[PDB]
Amino acid sequence: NIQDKALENFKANQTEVTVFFLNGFQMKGVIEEYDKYVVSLNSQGKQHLIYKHAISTYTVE
Amino acid sequence: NIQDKALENFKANQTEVTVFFLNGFQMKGVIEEYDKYVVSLNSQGKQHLIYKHAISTYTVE
Amino acid sequence: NIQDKALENFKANQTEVTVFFLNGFQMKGVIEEYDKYVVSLNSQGKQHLIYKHAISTYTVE
Amino acid sequence: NIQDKALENFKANQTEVTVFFLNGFQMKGVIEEYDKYVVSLNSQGKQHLIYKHAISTYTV
Amino acid sequence: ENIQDKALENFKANQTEVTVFFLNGFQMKGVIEEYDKYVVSLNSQGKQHLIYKHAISTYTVE
Amino acid sequence: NIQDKALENFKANQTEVTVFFLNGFQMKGVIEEYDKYVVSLNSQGKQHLIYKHAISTYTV
RNA sequence: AUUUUUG
């Protein structure tokens, strides 16, 4: 299970991740929480709740 | 459940959330009800029964 | 399950809903009958068997 | 289960149905077979095996 | 009752020229080498292609 | 099952895989690891955790 | 509502 380990890892190290969506949209932020379907991303201070079915790629720095 | 506890929060407080669809379009309204597949959003008097598969993110102004 | 309760209501009350597709297209008709995977709509005479995966939102007044 | 009741009468009566795809493109033909995921459509003279996930609506 | 695997089968053995249609509009021609629940392997321009079924719209011959 | 076989192979010898996304875009790299849903691809120095629902084709 | 038909 690479996913939970990766999300867990980001959440922990408070890594600034770039989330690429399927429609070409994107947000740079920090993964705060997450379950089987969503992912909570703190970006520019505002909280964004994201469905994984919309996410495409998670990229680091 | 990160999702459900978030969906209940908006629901309970009549919070004004912005819903972003996978097609870029966005809607603002209160979360009247929800379940495992859809979300009912009261917005501008009219009721919108929205499918989760068509949503990508939730946020507040 | 809010989805089914809302659809029987649209089916019973014989109310004219507007179906918004993911690609931006819209159709305004009446919800004949439905099931798990699809929805039969009587819009502009001819009938249409729509997949819920193509649907974004149901909008009533 | 309305999806099958619909896919049966189209096949049984060799009904000419219009298939609209998610991208808006539309095809015309007769449904010959179908299972859980795909549907075999004969259009003009060539067979097309189509995944339901690629379909938007059926119209007659 | 499962025509998907009945169709993917005849193709494989007869190495018949199949034309794959992607949802994104793309096209690819070739012979079905292998397949399963989630993917399909199509051999085209001397190259191998492992394709997700969720990206495919339709299969057509010739 | 061809998926896990192929995925494991590329991962075995760290092959040069070209991943095509549903939007036609492509990224060339080596499949580090993978699971039922995602795939970790190192390409151009960066590491990308990609969901299988977002991928279209793998090429060698 | 997270890898082939309420996606």
Side-chain angles (χ1 to χ4, degrees), chain A residues 1-50:
Chain A
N1 193 82
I2 312 182
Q3 210 192 313
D4 286 23
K5 258 141 176 179
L7 303 192
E8 224 307 289
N9 193 164
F10 296 140
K11 182 199 204 307
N13 305 319
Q14 277 165 294
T15 310
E16 193 85 32
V17 299
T18 292
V19 195
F20 290 87
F21 297 54
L22 288 181
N23 54 24
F25 184 61
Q26 61 178 86
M27 290 187 280
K28 182 191 181 184
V30 177
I31 287 184
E32 268 174 350
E33 282 180 295
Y34 71 87
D35 53 38
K36 170 158 58 183
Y37 300 113
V38 302
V39 159
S40 180
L41 185 105
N42 181 296
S43 178
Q44 65 213 72
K46 200 183 303 174
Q47 209 64 47
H48 301 286
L49 193 51
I50 309 170

Side-chain angles (χ1 to χ4, degrees), chain C residues 33-34 46 48-49 51 53-54, chain D residues 2-3 55-56 58-60:
Chain C
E33 44 189 298
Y34 60 85
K46 305 225 288 188
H48 311 80
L49 195 66
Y51 276 105
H53 61 222
Chain D
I2 306 177
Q3 169 170 28
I55 300 182
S56 193
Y58 290 106
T59 301
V60 180

Side-chain angles (χ1 to χ4, degrees), chain B:
Chain B
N1 237 70
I2 301 292
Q3 179 180 177
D4 284 37
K5 89 172 60 176
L7 256 36
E8 203 51 55
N9 198 77
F10 304 133
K11 184 183 181 170
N13 318 319
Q14 301 271 181
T15 303
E16 275 292 312
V17 298
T18 295
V19 191
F20 293 85
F21 295 73
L22 288 170
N23 59 32
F25 185 64
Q26 52 181 259
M27 224 175 268
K28 186 175 270 286
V30 175
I31 307 304
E32 250 43 50
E33 294 161 49
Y34 80 88
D35 66 39
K36 181 178 185 178
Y37 295 117
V38 308
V39 175
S40 187
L41 184 93
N42 189 309
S43 169
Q44 297 156 54
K46 45 180 185 173
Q47 177 243 306
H48 308 284
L49 185 58
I50 312 161
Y51 275 111
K52 289 176 175 180
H53 60 234
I55 293 178
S56 62
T57 311
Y58 298 97
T59 83
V60 175
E61 182 285 271

Side-chain angles (χ1 to χ4, degrees), chain E residues 18 20 28-34 40-44 47-51:
Chain E
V18 186
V20 179
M28 199 174 262
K29 192 150 186 172
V31 179
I32 302 175
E33 298 293 299
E34 288 157 35
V40 169
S41 177
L42 202 87
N43 194 288
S44 191
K47 194 144 59 78
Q48 209 81 297
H49 304 289
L50 193 67
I51 305 172

